[PDB]
Design an enzyme around this catalytic site. Structure first.
Site, PDB file in Angstrom:
ATOM      1  N   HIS B  74       0.832  -1.203   0.000  1.00 28.41           N
ATOM      2  CA  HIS B  74       0.000   0.000   0.000  1.00 28.41           C
ATOM      3  C   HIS B  74       0.871   1.259   0.000  1.00 28.41           C
ATOM      4  O   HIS B  74       0.899   2.047   0.946  1.00 28.41           O
ATOM      5  CB  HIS B  74      -0.962  -0.025   1.180  1.00 28.41           C
ATOM      6  CG  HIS B  74      -2.056  -1.037   1.039  1.00 28.41           C
ATOM      7  ND1 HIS B  74      -2.049  -2.241   1.709  1.00 28.41           N
ATOM      8  CD2 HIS B  74      -3.184  -1.031   0.289  1.00 28.41           C
ATOM      9  CE1 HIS B  74      -3.130  -2.929   1.386  1.00 28.41           C
ATOM     10  NE2 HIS B  74      -3.835  -2.218   0.525  1.00 28.41           N
ATOM     11  N   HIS B  78       1.237   1.232  -5.774  1.00 27.42           N
ATOM     12  CA  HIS B  78      -0.153   0.789  -5.800  1.00 27.42           C
ATOM     13  C   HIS B  78      -1.086   1.928  -6.191  1.00 27.42           C
ATOM     14  O   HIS B  78      -2.034   1.728  -6.960  1.00 27.42           O
ATOM     15  CB  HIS B  78      -0.541   0.221  -4.437  1.00 27.42           C
ATOM     16  CG  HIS B  78      -2.007  -0.034  -4.284  1.00 27.42           C
ATOM     17  ND1 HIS B  78      -2.687  -0.957  -5.048  1.00 27.42           N
ATOM     18  CD2 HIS B  78      -2.924   0.518  -3.456  1.00 27.42           C
ATOM     19  CE1 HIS B  78      -3.959  -0.968  -4.693  1.00 27.42           C
ATOM     20  NE2 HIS B  78      -4.130  -0.080  -3.730  1.00 27.42           N
ATOM     21  N   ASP B 115      -5.401   5.428  -0.990  1.00 27.39           N
ATOM     22  CA  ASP B 115      -4.676   4.701   0.049  1.00 27.39           C
ATOM     23  C   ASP B 115      -3.573   5.540   0.685  1.00 27.39           C
ATOM     24  O   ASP B 115      -2.665   4.981   1.308  1.00 27.39           O
ATOM     25  CB  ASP B 115      -4.077   3.402  -0.501  1.00 27.39           C
ATOM     26  CG  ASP B 115      -5.039   2.232  -0.426  1.00 27.39           C
ATOM     27  OD1 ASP B 115      -5.953   2.261   0.424  1.00 27.39           O
ATOM     28  OD2 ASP B 115      -4.866   1.271  -1.202  1.00 27.39           O
ATOM     29  N   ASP B 232      -8.818  -1.288  -7.847  1.00 22.66           N
ATOM     30  CA  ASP B 232      -8.159  -1.645  -6.597  1.00 22.66           C
ATOM     31  C   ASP B 232      -7.901  -3.145  -6.508  1.00 22.66           C
ATOM     32  O   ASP B 232      -6.889  -3.567  -5.936  1.00 22.66           O
ATOM     33  CB  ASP B 232      -9.014  -1.176  -5.419  1.00 22.66           C
ATOM     34  CG  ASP B 232      -8.231  -1.074  -4.130  1.00 22.66           C
ATOM     35  OD1 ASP B 232      -7.016  -0.803  -4.198  1.00 22.66           O
ATOM     36  OD2 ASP B 232      -8.834  -1.252  -3.050  1.00 22.66           O
ATOM     37  N   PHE B 286      -8.724 -15.857  -3.068  1.00 23.81           N
ATOM     38  CA  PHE B 286      -8.941 -14.435  -3.324  1.00 23.81           C
ATOM     39  C   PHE B 286      -9.633 -14.218  -4.665  1.00 23.81           C
ATOM     40  O   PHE B 286     -10.607 -13.461  -4.761  1.00 23.81           O
ATOM     41  CB  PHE B 286      -7.592 -13.712  -3.266  1.00 23.81           C
ATOM     42  CG  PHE B 286      -7.657 -12.230  -3.508  1.00 23.81           C
ATOM     43  CD1 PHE B 286      -8.565 -11.432  -2.832  1.00 23.81           C
ATOM     44  CD2 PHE B 286      -6.756 -11.626  -4.373  1.00 23.81           C
ATOM     45  CE1 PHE B 286      -8.600 -10.062  -3.045  1.00 23.81           C
ATOM     46  CE2 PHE B 286      -6.780 -10.260  -4.588  1.00 23.81           C
ATOM     47  CZ  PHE B 286      -7.704  -9.476  -3.923  1.00 23.81           C
TER      48      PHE B 286
HETATM   49  C1  LIG Z   1      -4.727 -12.975  -0.935  1.00 23.66           C
HETATM   50  C2  LIG Z   1      -5.015 -11.512  -0.962  1.00 23.66           C
HETATM   51  O1  LIG Z   1      -4.244 -10.943  -2.028  1.00 23.66           O
HETATM   52  C3  LIG Z   1      -4.339  -9.597  -2.277  1.00 23.66           C
HETATM   53  C4  LIG Z   1      -5.148  -8.720  -1.573  1.00 23.66           C
HETATM   54  C5  LIG Z   1      -5.175  -7.361  -1.907  1.00 23.66           C
HETATM   55  C6  LIG Z   1      -6.018  -6.336  -1.282  1.00 23.66           C
HETATM   56  C7  LIG Z   1      -6.702  -6.297  -0.126  1.00 23.66           C
HETATM   57  C8  LIG Z   1      -6.780  -7.204   1.034  1.00 23.66           C
HETATM   58  O2  LIG Z   1      -6.268  -8.278   1.228  1.00 23.66           O
HETATM   59  O3  LIG Z   1      -7.604  -6.638   1.981  1.00 23.66           O
HETATM   60  C9  LIG Z   1      -8.055  -5.425   1.486  1.00 23.66           C
HETATM   61  C10 LIG Z   1      -8.903  -4.561   2.145  1.00 23.66           C
HETATM   62  C11 LIG Z   1      -9.263  -3.382   1.501  1.00 23.66           C
HETATM   63  O4  LIG Z   1     -10.119  -2.510   2.110  1.00 23.66           O
HETATM   64  C12 LIG Z   1      -8.771  -3.091   0.231  1.00 23.66           C
HETATM   65  C13 LIG Z   1      -7.916  -3.978  -0.406  1.00 23.66           C
HETATM   66  C14 LIG Z   1      -7.541  -5.164   0.220  1.00 23.66           C
HETATM   67  C15 LIG Z   1      -4.374  -6.912  -2.955  1.00 23.66           C
HETATM   68  C16 LIG Z   1      -3.562  -7.778  -3.665  1.00 23.66           C
HETATM   69  C17 LIG Z   1      -3.539  -9.121  -3.332  1.00 23.66           C
HETATM   70  O5  LIG Z   1      -2.801 -10.067  -3.984  1.00 23.66           O
HETATM   71  C18 LIG Z   1      -2.071  -9.652  -5.136  1.00 23.66           C
HETATM   72 MG   LIG Z   2      -7.532   0.877   0.626  1.00 16.24          MG
HETATM   73 ZN   LIG Z   3      -5.908   0.111  -2.562  1.00 14.25          ZN
END
Ligand SMILES: CCOc1cc(/C=C2\C(=O)Oc3cc(O)ccc32)ccc1OC
Ligand SMILES: [Mg+2]
Ligand SMILES: [Zn+2]
Ligand SMILES: CCOc1cc(/C=C2/C(=O)Oc3cc(O)ccc32)ccc1OC
Ligand SMILES: [Mg+2]
Ligand SMILES: [Zn+2]
Lengths: 324, 324
Positions: B74, B78, B115, B232, B286
Site C-alpha cells: 500500500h 499501488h 490509500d 483496486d 482471493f
Molecule cells: C490474498 C489476498 O491478495 C491480495 C489482496 C489485496 C487487497 C486487499 C486485502 O487483502 O484486503 C483489502 C482490504 C481493503 O479494504 C482493500 C484492499 C484489500 C491486494 C492484492 C492481493 O494479492 C495480489
Molecule cells: Mg484501501
Molecule cells: Zn488500494
C-alpha cells in the site's frame, strides 16, 4: 447547606421533569458528574462493573470539562438532561429491564458523551466553513463522530478508564453499541430512524406481563438508538418551565451561529437569524413535524408507559401555539 | 537518457498491463506523479479545469510523499497502478460519453488518494490495537476515512490546490463523489457493492448508441465506486509477471502485520502468518471468492469490453492453482 438541597433535588433522579438547571446551579456547574454518579449508584453499576468511584468521578469531571461552558444549549446541562432522560425511558415497565447491564451502561454512557466538545454550530456550518472537523470526518455525521472520539479518548486519561474491569469482549460490545447510539443522534438520520421505529411498532410483540419482546441485536440497538434520540428531543415533553429554558438556550445558540454566518457573509441557517425569527412558530413546527411524530411512535411502542410524557408534549404545543 | 526510456514506457498509459514497476524505477520512485501528470495531459484535464501545471506537479509530489515508502504493497506504486487502471476502465467503449469531465476527474483523483498514508496494516488491526486512527474514526472505514482526510488536506499546502479554478458547485460535487468512491474501497463494503452491481447488470439500460444509460447520481456513483474498486482489485487481472510482484508485496505486508500481531499475543490474522500461510492457495481463494465474482460482474456490465481482462484473470487463476 448547599449539599443538602442538591441531595434533595437528586431524589427526583427517577422522574421526568427532573429539576436539572437548579441541580446545575447547586452542584457548582457539575450536573453531568452528579447526575451520572447518582444514576450509577441508583443502578448499582459501580459494583456490577467494578468501577472505582474515584475513577468514575475523575472521568465524569474530565468529560464534563470538555463540554463548552460558553455554548448556550449543547453543554453539560444538556448532556446531564439527556442522561437522566435516558435513565427514565430505560425503566419504563414495557422495557424494564430487557437490556442487560451492558446495553443499559451503553445507553447511559452514550447519552453522557453524545454532544461532548460541541462548538455550538451545526454539521452544515462546519461543512460550509471548511472546518478541520468536516475535513477530518468527510462531511458525514461530523459532530457525532467527534463526540464519540472525544468521549472514548478521555477514558485514556489518568484514572479515567471506568471500563478497566470489563472483559475485553464487554469493552468491544459496549464500544460498538455506544458508537451505534451516538451516530444515530445525527438529525439527518431522524427520518430513517423513525420509519424503522414505526415498522417495529407494527410488528410488535410483548409478554402478557407487558414487557416488549425483542430477539435480535438489530432491533434492540434500534430501540436504544430511538430512546437516546427521544431523550435528545425530549425538551418539548418536559414541564413548560423547563421547556422554555431549553428554547431560550437553543435559540441563543442558533442566533450566535447566524451571527457568525452573517459576519462571514454566509447564508443564514434556518431559525438562526435573530432579525427574522419566530421562536414560537418554530417550536410548534418542531413539535408538529419532528418531536410529536417521534414521541407518538415511541408511546405506541411502550404503550401506555409514555402517556404522561406525551400529554405534557401536547399541552406544551397548545401553549406555544396560543402565544402566536 | 533515462527520461527517454521513461517517456517510451509512458506511451502505454492507455494499456492494461502498463509496466508500473519499471515506471516507478525510471521516474526516481515517482510513479504516481508521472502517471497522474501523463493522464491529466492525455485527457485534456489541466485545460478543462484550468489546473496550473506547477500546482499539479506540486500536489502530486506532496501526495506521493505521503504514501509510505516503507510499506510493501500500500505505497505510491499501488496508487499509480490504481490510477492507471481506473484511467483504462474509464475509456471502455460501453462508457463513452457517459461521465462528465468532473466525474472523470473525481474518479482519477479518488484513485490517486485512495490509500494515501496507509500504515501497512488492516482496519481490523487498527481496531484491535486501539490505534489513534480507529479511535478517531470510531472503527468504521478507519483507513478509508483517513485516506480521504489526508488527500483533501494536502490540497491546502502551498501551491497545492489543483481545484483552485473549479466553481463552488464543481468542488462540492467533486468532493462528495471522491468521498463516496474512496469509502467504497473498504472491503467491508464489497458484498453489498457487488450485490448492487449485479442488480444493475440484470436491469441494465443502454442508449441508442449501445452505451450504458445512467439516469441519476445513485447509478452513476455506483458505477464509479465499483470501477475504482475493480481497479483496486485488478492485480490478478494483470499480466502474470505484474500480478506475481503484487502478490510478493501483499504477502510481505501481511507477514509484517502478522509479526506485529504474533508479538502481542494476538491471534494472527488470516494470511499474515509467515510460518503458516499458503500464498498460492490464498490467491486462488482471493480470485474465486472476491476478484472473479467482481470482475465477471463488471465484465457483464460492459460486455464484451472486458473479455481480455477477464480471460487473463481466469488464466492467472489457472496458473496459481496449477502450483498447488
Ligand atoms: C490474498 C489476498 O491478495 C491480495 C489482496 C489485496 C487487497 C486487499 C486485502 O487483502 O484486503 C483489502 C482490504 C481493503 O479494504 C482493500 C484492499 C484489500 C491486494 C492484492 C492481493 O494479492 C495480489
Ligand atoms: Mg484501501
Ligand atoms: Zn488500494
Ligand atoms: C425549533 C428548534 O427547537 C429545538 C431544536 C433542538 C435541536 C435541533 C438540533 O440540534 O438540530 C435541529 C435541526 C432541526 O431541523 C430541528 C431541531 C434541531 C433542541 C431543542 C429545541 O427547542 C427547545
Ligand atoms: Mg448532537
Ligand atoms: Zn444532543
Amino acid at each position: 447547606e448547599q449539599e443538602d438541597v442538591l441531595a434533595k433535588e437528586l431524589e427526583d433522579v427517577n422522574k421526568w421533569g427532573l429539576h436539572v438547571f437548579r441541580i446545575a446551579e447547586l452542584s457548582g456547574n457539575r450536573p453531568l458528574t452528579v447526575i451520572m454518579h447518582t444514576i450509577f449508584q441508583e443502578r448499582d453499576l459501580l459494583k456490577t462493573f467494578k468501577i472505582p468511584v474515584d475513577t468514575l468521578i475523575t472521568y465524569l469531571m474530565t468529560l464534563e470539562d470538555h463540554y463548552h461552558a460558553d455554548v448556550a444549549y449543547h453543554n453539560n446541562i444538556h448532556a446531564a438532561d439527556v442522561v437522566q432522560s435516558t435513565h427514565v425511558l430505560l425503566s419504563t415497565p414495557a422495557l424494564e429491564a430487557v437490556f442487560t447491564d451492558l446495553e443499559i451502561l451503553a445507553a447511559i454512557f452514550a447519552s453522557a458523551i453524545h454532544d461532548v466538545d460541541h462548538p455550538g454550530v451545526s454539521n452544515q456550518f462546519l461543512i460550509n466553513t471548511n472546518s478541520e472537523l468536516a475535513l477530518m470526518y468527510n462531511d458525514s455525521s461530523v459532530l457525532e463522530n467527534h463526540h464519540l472520539a472525544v468521549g472514548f479518548k478521555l477514558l485514556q486519561e489518568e484514572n479515567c478508564d471506568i471500563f478497566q474491569n470489563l472483559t475485553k469482549k464487554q469493552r468491544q460490545s459496549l464500544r460498538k453499541m455506544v458508537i451505534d447510539i451516538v451516530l444515530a443522534t445525527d438529525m439527518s438520520k431522524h427520518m430513517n430512524l423513525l420509519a424503522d421505529l414505526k415498522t417495529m411498532v407494527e410488528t410488535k410483540k410483548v409478554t402478557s406481563s407487558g414487557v416488549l419482546l425483542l430477539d435480535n441485536y438489530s432491533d434492540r440497538i434500534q430501540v436504544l438508538q430511538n430512546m437516546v434520540h427521544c431523550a435528545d428531543l425530549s425538551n418539548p415533553t418536559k414541564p413548560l418551565q423547563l421547556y422554555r429554558q431549553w428554547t431560550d438556550r437553543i435559540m441563543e445558540e442558533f442566533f450566535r451561529q447566524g451571527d457568525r454566518e452573517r459576519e462571514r457573509g454566509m447564508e443564514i441557517s434556518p431559525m438562526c437569524d435573530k432579525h427574522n425569527a419566530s421562536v414560537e412558530k418554530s417550536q410548534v413546527g418542531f413539535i408538529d413535524y419532528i418531536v410529536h411524530p417521534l414521541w407518538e411512535t415511541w408511546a405506541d411502542l411502550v404503550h401506555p408507559d409514555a402517556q404522561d410524557i406525551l400529554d405534557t408534549l401536547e399541552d406544551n404545543r397548545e401553549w406555544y401555539q396560543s402565544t402566536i
